[PDB]
């Protein structure tokens, strides 16, 4: 038993085991696990199983994905019998929006490897002979998949990691982690003590717990989930091939076959499930494991009684089984993956919703991740600092409550839900726009997505096709080509940073050029190999000193990479986080100057406040710093302001503008405005997966700056050999839909790409996409086939931008 490991893994259960195997045979060298009891003695054991290629997200599909491929080498890796059972998972829709999500969820899986299939009612009556095929409509279908034995597939992974030279201690708990300043950790079993390069928390719903172990708020919550499994059924028996698993997502509830029998579980209503609050405030009894709870077959009776009608069999059969078990929820039932902010060398893999179908894949990413040092794709869905301190228990028991609940409903594009809103992250702004708009949840915060005219329709109507919010994004579109409008931004991720060392931070941290003092410049921070981890505003204000702006979730995600990138160079900065305290104001449109030129004695002139330009002024006698920029490509400010002014400047901007008929905007109107100028959003047209030469952000890029930039030479190696994709510009003709992003694009045949954005454009009267596609495909004037709710449509590529910004022109 050594005393110095190279990583420690806090967690026997099969998220642990996945990253030990993983680290191991990539040949980390003395990987430690540590567990509390046994392997699998966490939620793990007492599993259903189910393991699917589908998932509604996009790049979780690579997850899903790299674990089934995996699950399948696994005897073939280790000796043992894996228990792996693949006839196929099979969706089902009884109702005709259902028809609807499959042909939107189709779209999305088309520029992916997971196989995936919309089938008709006569290919699942051959293929589920006793399902009730009465209220069927149609089925979305994987092969290859099905479900595993949770014990048998934990010990495999242990099998393989033990023999490339992971050491697997238990019983060894973690009583006390200590940080120590040179970055490295003190673990503490009743063993003894050891060090650790870095440490991965993977305990389950213990995770929370550990989380605190270093004074670390970790959002989960236990939660309560049961299903069932029948006695043996005569028809089921007498298949000559086994079922495939089903989903009555009408029913909420998925189904296989267990033995000759049925093993189903529903997701009861997010008012009638039952969650372990006593848990969080207590912490897991001591002593908890190989164990359950008491089932409650009463309180999912309702559910049953479905089950039973989309597969009569189960009217007559018999209960062998209940299983009620806990699960760690996070609250949007995403796990939470990554390194920690905050704290050096703390990685997590916590609040595994699905853990059994997640936990190779997630294991491929981390080990993937740790010994490379960025993300292999991107996964910001995924990040576990998504979250923050507006993230209470209190609200972490509400979504995750919601997240439940909600297992099964219609997966619309621009979901909204409501559950624990609003929260303490608001501007002062909140209560008074809140009244007048639809608020969009990002980040904690509460921002305006569209905004009600008057005598038209108020209520939340989600969509495959265009809907309620479609013509008031139009007039607020119309508002700001032809006057002067505000939005509220003070969502952005906000860091100032000062210091000696601070060009030399941010000249290797950012690709383009540092910024004159006084100036602003759009820059990204590349991964060393050469991917767009981030885009962000860089503010030169005082000499040195800078102000750097983000987008609202991919703030903790950016500050992590500038923090740790301080601590390797062993930089001479400070850093600090003022996001919270400022509130942002874009005041955008050809009338903007004349507006606030009259609530401020500072000079507006285009001569004057040169475009980019960052000054310090007064705007109604309120302190603001105003940036001669604009996401609208309209002429226009950013006001960054203290939170406490929010009112008061949007009042006297309101007040003022009045006269050229000023009025508000939302994030719906800003996205058709962007798109129309060209501009890239960050998490869309790039991310992790994307390099910023294919993207065509070539003019942000300046590759023989003197500095040797994080990423830089990578690039150059890119330059050398030429892209492979590039992205482009469509325009098509809808009827009553538009792209969103993510949907497939085909061409003679072959889906070759997909979009990122789109939006109607309504200037135009067609639709906008952003598209990757091959560099043969990418000329202008080129038409492609955009796949929209299983109709192609014709797309063509235009000659970008469509609309000149307004220094452009
Ligand atoms: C309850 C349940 C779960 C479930 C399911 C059906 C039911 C009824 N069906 C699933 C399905 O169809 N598909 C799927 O993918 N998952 C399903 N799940 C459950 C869940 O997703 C998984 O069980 C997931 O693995 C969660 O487990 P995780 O890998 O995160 O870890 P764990 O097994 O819960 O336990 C972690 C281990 O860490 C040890 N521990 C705890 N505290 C400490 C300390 N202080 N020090 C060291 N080690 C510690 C625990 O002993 C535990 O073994």
Redesign the pocket.
């Known amino acids: 038993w050594k005393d110095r490991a190279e990583t420690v893994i ?7 085991v996945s990253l030990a195997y993983h680290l191991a045979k990539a040949g980390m060298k003395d990987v430690v696990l ?4 046994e392997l ?5 054991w ?5 393991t699917t290629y589908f998932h509604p997200g996009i790049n979780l599909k690579k997850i899903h994905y790299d674990s089934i491929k995996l699950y399948e080498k696994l005897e073939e890796e280790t000796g043992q019998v894996v228990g792996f059972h693949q006839p196929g998972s099979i969706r089902l829709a009884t109702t005709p929006v259902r028809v609807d999500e499959f042909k939107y969820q189709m779209t999305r899986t088309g520029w992916h490897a997971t196989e995936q299939y919309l089938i008709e009612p006569e290919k699942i009556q051959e293929m589920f002979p006793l399902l009730n095929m009465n209220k069927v409509l149609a089925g979305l279908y994987n092969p290859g998949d099905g479900h595993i034995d949770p014990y048998s597939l934990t010990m495999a992974l242990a099998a393989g990691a033990r023999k490339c030279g992971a050491l697997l201690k238990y019983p060894a ?2 009583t006390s982690l200590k940080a120590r300043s040179d970055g490295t950790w003190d673990v503490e079993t009743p063993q003894g003590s050891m060090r650790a390069n870095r440490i991965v928390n ?5 995770a929370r ?2 989380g605190k172990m270093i004074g670390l708020e970790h959002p989960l919550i236990p939660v309560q ?3 069932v499994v029948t006695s043996t059924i005569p028809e089921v028996k007498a298949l000559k091939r086994e079922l495939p698993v089903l989903r009555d997502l009408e029913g909420s509830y998925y189904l296989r076959q267990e033995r000759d029998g049925l093993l189903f ?1 529903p997701y009861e209503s997010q008012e009638k499930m039952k969650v372990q609050d006593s848990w969080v405030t207590n912490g897991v009894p001591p002593g908890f ?1 190989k164990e359950l709870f008491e089932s409650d077959l009463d309180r999912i009776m309702e559910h049953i009684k479905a089950a039973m009608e989309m597969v009569p069999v189960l009217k007559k059969a018999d209960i062998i089984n209940v ?1 009620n ?4 929820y996070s609250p949007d039932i995403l796990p939470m993956v990554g390194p920690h902010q905050g704290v050096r060398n703390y990685w997590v893999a ?1 609040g ?8 190779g894949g997630v294991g491929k990413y981390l080990s993937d991740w740790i010994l490379h040092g960025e993300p292999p794709f991107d996964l910001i869905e995924l990040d576990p600092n998504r979250y923050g301190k507006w993230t209470t228990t209190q609200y972490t028991e509400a979504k995750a409550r919601e997240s439940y609940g909600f297992n099964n409903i219609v997966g619309y594009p621009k979901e909204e839900r409501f559950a624990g809103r609003p929260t303490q992250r608001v501007s002062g702004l909140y209560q008074r726009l809140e009244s007048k708009c639809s608020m969009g949840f990002h980040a904690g915060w509460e921002q305006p997505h569209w905004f009600y005219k008057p005598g038209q329709d108020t209520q939340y109507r989600p969509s495959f096709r265009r809907t309620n919010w479609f013509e008031p994004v139009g007039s607020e579109y119309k508002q700001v080509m032809q006057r002067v409008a505000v939005t509220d931004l003070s969502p952005f991720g906000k860091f100032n940073i000062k210091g000696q060392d601070s060009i030399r931070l941010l000249d290797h941290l950012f690709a383009n050029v540092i910024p004159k003092v006084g100036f602003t410049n759009i820059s990204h921070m590349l991964t060393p190999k050469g991917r767009v981890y981030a885009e962000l505003t860089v503010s030169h204000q005082s000499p040195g000193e800078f102000l750097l702006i983000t987008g609202s979730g991919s703030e903790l995600h950016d500050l992590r990479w500038i923090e740790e990138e301080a601590v390797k160079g062993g930089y001479d900065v400070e850093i600090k986080n003022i996001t919270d305290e400022l509130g942002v104001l874009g005041v955008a449109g050809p009338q903007a100057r004349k507006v606030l030129q009259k609530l401020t004695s500072e000079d507006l002139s285009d001569d004057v406040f040169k475009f980019l330009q960052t000054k310090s002024l007064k705007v109604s006698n309120i302190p603001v710093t105003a940036i001669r920029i604009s996401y609208t490509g309209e002429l226009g400010w950013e006001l960054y302001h203290r939170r406490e002014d929010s009112v008061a400047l949007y009042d006297a901007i309101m007040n003022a503008g009045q006269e050229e008929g000023i009025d508000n905007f939302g994030t719906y109107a800003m996205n058709a405005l962007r798109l129309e100028k060209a501009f890239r959003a960050w998490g869309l047209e790039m991310n992790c997966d994307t390099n910023p030469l294919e993207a065509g952000l070539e003019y942000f890029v300046k590759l023989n700056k003197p500095a040797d930039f994080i990423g830089k030479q990578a690039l150059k190696q890119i330059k050398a050999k030429g892209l492979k994709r590039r992205l482009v510009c469509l325009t098509l003709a809808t009827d009553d839909v538009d792209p969103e992003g993510n949907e497939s694009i085909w061409y003679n045949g072959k889906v070759v790409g997909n979009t990122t954005s789109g939006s109607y454009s309504y200037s135009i009267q067609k639709s906008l996409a952003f598209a990757y596609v091959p560099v043969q495909l990418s000329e202008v004037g080129q038409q492609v086939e955009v796949e929209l709710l299983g109709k192609n449509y014709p797309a063509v590529i235009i000659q970008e931008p469509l609309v000149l910004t307004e220094p452009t022109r």
């Open positions: 806090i967690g026997g259960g099969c998220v642990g540590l567990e509390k009891s699998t003695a966490g939620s793990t007492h599993a259903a199983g189910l708990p973690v993977a305990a389950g719903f213990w717990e550990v989930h049961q299903y579980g494991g299983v078990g806990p699960i760690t916590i595994f919703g699905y853990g059994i179908i997640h936990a």
